[PDB]
């Protein structure tokens, strides 16, 4: 998720937020009308910091939402880990059965991504999601297809 971000769209969103706040450097300096560099620099830094914190928590929430689809289906159902480990401990062999089909993970991903408000809210989040999307679907198909035997 984080590798797909780009500098241009993030800068564009930051500039859009600045325009929405009406706190451009020209207006801010023309309003303050003082030479106290430390105070104005701290004000600008905190203005940026609030946006940085909000972006970080938004990305955290989206990342947890994406993670929530895969995790339950790992230890149980198709492609279970403890069954793999006890196969290794008993014999060292791991029989595996394969079939190419769509399952709960793929439908969960489809029902999750297609109607998430954060994509419409932020350009960077939407572009990162659409760029990294195919990998998520391929990983979901990989999770669904395999099944360690009983």
């Amino acid at each position: 998720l984080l590798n797909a971000t780009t500098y241009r769209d993030l800068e564009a969103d930051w500039l859009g937020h600045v325009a929405a706040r009406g706190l451009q450097p020209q207006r801010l300096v023309r309003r303050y009308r003082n030479a106290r560099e430390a105070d104005i620099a701290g004000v600008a830094e905190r203005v940026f910091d609030t946006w940085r914190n909000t972006l970080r928590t938004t990305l955290l929430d989206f990342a947890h939402g994406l993670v929530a689809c895969f995790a339950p289906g790992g230890p149980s159902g198709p492609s279970s880990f403890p069954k793999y480990i006890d196969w290794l401990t008993c014999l060292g062999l791991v029989p595996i059965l394969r079939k190419r089909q769509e399952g709960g993970v793929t439908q969960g991903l489809r029902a999750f991504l297609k109607q998430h408000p954060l994509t419409r809210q932020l350009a960077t989040v939407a572009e990162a999601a659409e760029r990294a999307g195919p990998g998520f679907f391929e990983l979901a198909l990989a999770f669904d297809s395999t099944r360690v035997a009983d």
Binding site: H17, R21, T54, L55, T58, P117
Partner: peptide, 7 residues
Amino acid sequence: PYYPGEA
């Protein structure tokens, strides 16, 4: 004014 986490 808009913020990333807001509705």
